[PDB]
Amino acid sequence: MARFFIDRPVFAWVISLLIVLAGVLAIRFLPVAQYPDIAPPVVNVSASYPGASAKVVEEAVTAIIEREMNGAPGLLYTKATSSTGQASLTLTFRQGVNADLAAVEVQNRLKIVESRLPESVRRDGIYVEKAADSIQLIVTLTSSSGRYDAMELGEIASSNVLQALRRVEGVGKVETWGAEYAMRIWPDPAKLTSMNLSASDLVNAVRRHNARLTVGDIGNLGVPDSAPISATVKVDDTLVTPEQFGEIPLRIRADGGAIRLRDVARVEFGQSEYGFVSRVNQMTATGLAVKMAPGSNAVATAKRIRATLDELSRYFPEGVSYNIPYDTSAFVEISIRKVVSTLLEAMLLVFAVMYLFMQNFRATLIPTLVVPVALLGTFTVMLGLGFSINVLTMFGMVLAIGILVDDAIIVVENVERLMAEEGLSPHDATVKAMRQISGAIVGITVVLVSVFVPMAFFSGAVGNIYRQFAVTLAVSIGFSAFLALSLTPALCATLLRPIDADHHEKRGFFGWFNRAFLRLTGRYRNAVAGILARPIRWMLVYTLVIGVVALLFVRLPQAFLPEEDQGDFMIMVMQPEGTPMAETMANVGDVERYLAEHEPVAYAYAVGGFSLYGDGTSSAMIFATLKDWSERREASQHVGAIVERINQRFAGLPNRTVYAMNSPPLPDLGSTSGFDFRLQDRGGVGYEALVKARDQLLARAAEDPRLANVMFAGQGEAPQIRLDIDRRKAETLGVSMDEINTTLAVMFGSDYIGDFMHGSQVRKVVVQADGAKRLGIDDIGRLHVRNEQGEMVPLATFAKAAWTLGPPQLTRYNGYPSFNLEGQAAPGYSSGEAMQAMEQLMQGLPEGIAHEWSGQSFEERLSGAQAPALFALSVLIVFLALAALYESWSIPLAVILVVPLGVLGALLGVSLRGLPNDIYFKVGLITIIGLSAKNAILIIEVAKDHYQEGMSLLQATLEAARLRLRPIVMTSLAFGFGVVPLALSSGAGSGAQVAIGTGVLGGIVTATVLAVFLVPLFFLVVGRLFR
To answer: What is the DSSP string of 499-557?
Structure first.
């Protein structure tokens, strides 16, 4: 096949141009992403059970459905959250399971248990939807100057903009924050008492016009926190403006006049204190949280969203403008731009290493043309196999560049040798070279291509990460084998002039270098000879280096992904249950003001009432986009320093929590950035004991130096009023359950719900998680109801109320009751160290309490638990591939003992730079193993086909070490200089680049220096001990 292309130059030329043209086409039709698609298939079962308590919802809906979904096809884990309103069931499936299969499977299992569900749940809708609950982009609409009307701007955003966004391809579901608004009524105690009007009089009179009343602080007129009456208003309603509300007649006067609502109350229109309240850059606005459709391209969807928005902006009245304060897609351009630059730097650097050795323009150009054709070839293979231009695929192409030229070195070098050391014509020089070295090319591409296939056959989203590296490298190396057997044959023959194969030219720096390298090769040959002279005493040194390999491995901490500064972050702004919205937004303003006046923040969007830990009046969050990295070129201006600063400054304010975290790198695995620890009640020990374990384990995490910010990612117990109805004599005394339930519902709103029933006891709870004063247990007893004979009866005869505390939410993980915990690794410490910290602190906990890692945490544990298998199989197939290629069981053994040499440098490189054993390190480790095999098999191949016998085989192996020292140094130095721009990356996106490059740069240095001294030894002990 080689001789085919030597005598046919143009035939190889047109093929190479065909690859380039196809690759260029692939670029134009290839999606760009920061990462590949990592999201596992998730199905959400949502059910509503209005008026039911969280316990009732869980027992009647959540637990029944969840119990049915135990044995689903590749169901990884189940999560459940039963709250007052709804039941929610999240079912995460194995990787590679068809989402529509999982969707159909969960739908079918739902129809089995549906008839056992409460009727009102079924008819309201039990939805089964593919989960895409991660927020990618946030759009705010603001009014420049004073164009803001709560009715107008809220509906401008929710109607005109949201309808367009929903039609934008790639947009899954949009949550509207700040578009629910209410009439606020503030009764005056003086005017109420001056007339003969009661609080119930106002509530009941208003209820004749608007039944969407939320009562709050009707029991605190005069120093109110929440508006005593809040009437959510819709455009269809009979009364809309506050002037209409003020006109509501309350009672007539003796003189014929009428008392109106405006006469005893202050009437206002504004955003509802019980919906969502949004704000961007300390200004009131309406937010639209965009969740992109599963499987869409984030960048492309953002461009359409932007295009559809600024096309809508021209219709805005002056003052109204649209802003995007939060866009995770923004970083994709920055990361892909940097890796493309680093790819260019690697090409510019390997060219320098080639030129330093071969020292002519023509023979340097011959291998440098292999890389673009092979890279553009892999670009075409990726389009069609289902891959994107992401940092991972581009990262591989960076590592490929140094490897890709390896075979084209060997042809050019040995052509030039046969052309000057033997006087051959350029045609016949290349002909003989391939008949000589094609075995070496075949051998090294066998190990290199093979070593990358085992990682592609692995589960999890780390498996998908591995496959992007595996395909981009095995195909490019496989290409570079083909180009070396086809392209470089022709180019060597047509382009190399006899004037170029000069062994010594350009006396000066280059002559100095040439003489120096030749001298170094001599001391190499003497140094090795000393080692083979005392081989038993140096094999003990080899036993030493594997020992420090193990010690370094045990010492090194492991992590998942490096912390990257992607220009944005988020802040949990939490208040204790029962905190009203006004305190929540005051606390948010404190964070808003601190960001504005003390930190480099471009935009800071803030929403009250929404939180990834649970909605409510005591929850709020802030999404923040930082200023450009150019304005933050300092250690104290990175994200981590900023979030550390924010969390420390606000830790001094008690009765509130402020948790600032860097944006999660893979939001489709989890909305937060930290660990997903799931405390489980696997033994049925009960809620009270589960709280005690959670609280005391939280305490242990506070004391541990490895952990930071470990906390309960949820809502604590909220105060509430429990009403017990023993022996429903109310029906015996004439009062109906309807009349009782309405009178409570009128003065408590939707907060009046029902709970668990036992033995003629109608248990009920008034929800007080919003901290309103309203009616106490004394008022509840003194409330009046009408029996069937028309009289007023005190409510206390048949109702016994009491204050109590209870969780607003009940969660379940893998079917057992849960507490969702989250936290961080302390500075300097690694994410894995944070994980083993938490597992260690579990030791002293009581009996029936287990734990599970979820989200990215679950994936990270998988990566570290399948690591030994991944390394063992990668060396094993190289063993078998060499055994198949060379029909021997002794050659693989000699080659195999080279891999610990390159491992030591990888371990040393990270261990001295303080970097962890992340998966970038694991990918580099596989690359180092393959390149170690290439180094060893390059000399062992020559040392075998020269001559072979027993009683020590010096003759061939030092001959091989002599011949192959230069070729292995060319190829190894090329790879090292290619990855130097990774190991020494500077600006944005550099966290991943130094992580991927540090281990691989250190690995190759000791995969070459420590190898050439030791692989001739390996060939000789295996020969000496196999006879």
So the answer is: GG--SS-STTHHHHHHHHHHHHHHHHHHHHHHHHHSHHHHHHHHHHHHHHHHHHHHHS-
Closest CA to 74 of 102, 54, 53, 48: 102
Is the CB of residue 324 less than 8 Å from the CB of residue 138?
yes
Q: Answer yes or no: is 36 within a domain.
A: no
**Is 508 contained in some domain?**
no
Distance (Å, whole) CA 798 – CA 787: 13
H helices of 134-264, where? 150-155, 162-167, 189-194, 199-207, 242-246, 261-264
Burial class (CB in 10 A: 0-12, 13-18, 19+), 239: middle
- Tokens linked to 261: 């609502």
Task: Quote the DSSP letter at residue 197.
Answer: -
Cα dihedral 597, 157, 570, 590 in deg (nearest 10): 40
- CB atoms closer than 10 angstroms to residue 317: 10
CB contact at 8 A, 822 and 672 = yes
Residue 988 near residue 387, CB atoms below 8 Å: no
Q: How would you label 974-991 residue by residue, b for 16+ Cβ within 10 Å and e otherwise? A: bbbbbbbbbbebeebbbb
* Assigned domain for 118 exists: yes
Asked whether residue 902 falls in the same domain as residue 974, the answer is yes
CA distance 752 to 942: 86
Residues 6+ apart with CB under 8 A from 652: none
Specify whether 420 is located in the same domain as 360: yes
- Cα distance between residue 520 and residue 534, in whole Å: 22
3-state secondary structure of 897: coil
How far is C-alpha 584 from the chain's CA centre? 29
Q: Return the amino acid letter for 1013.
A: F
User: Of 720, 780, 717, 718, which is closest to residue 751 (Cα–Cα)?
Assistant: 720
DSSP H or E run through 83: strand 75-83
Tokens 């399971």: give the residue. 97
- d(C-alpha 995, C-alpha 558), whole Å: 12
- The domain that holds 639 is classified in CATH as 3.30.70.1430
Instruction: Write the CB contacts of 738 (distance below 8 Å, at least 6 apart in sequence).
Output: none
Pairing status of strand 657-662 against strand 286-292: unpaired
Q: Which of the 8 DSSP states describes residue 684? A: -
Answer yes or no: do 315 and 348 share one domain.
Answer: no
Tokens of 306: 């932007």
Which amino acid type is present at position 818?
S
Cα angle 366-446-386, degrees, rounded to a multiple of 5: 85
Q: What is the DSSP string of 109-153?
A: HHHHHGGGS-HHHHHH-EEEEE------EEEEEEESTT---HHHH
**Which CATH number is 880's domain given?**
1.20.1640.10
Residues 496 and 404 in one domain: yes
Pairing of strands 792-794, 619-626: unpaired
Q: In the chain, how long is the greatest CA-to-CA distance? A: 129
Say which residue the tokens 């290619």 belong to.
978
- Distance between CA atoms of residues 3 and 49, nearest Å: 77
- Helix H or strand E encompassing 845: none
The token pair at 668 is: 């489709």
Amino acid at 941: E
Residue 673 is which amino acid? S
3-state secondary structure 421-438: CCCCCHHHHHHHHHHHHH
Of 167, 41, 20, residue with least CA distance to 104: 41
- For residues 61 and 113, give the distance between their C-alpha atoms in angstroms, rounded to a whole number: 10
Strands 75-83 and 126-130: unpaired
Cα angle 260, 264, 267 (rounded to 5 degrees) comes to 85
Contact (Cβ atoms closer than 8 angstroms) between residue 211 and residue 203: no
Q: Quick check: 657 and 711 in contact, CB under 8 A?
A: yes
The C-alpha R_g of the chain, in whole angstroms, comes to 36
Structural domain that includes position 316: 137-179+286-327
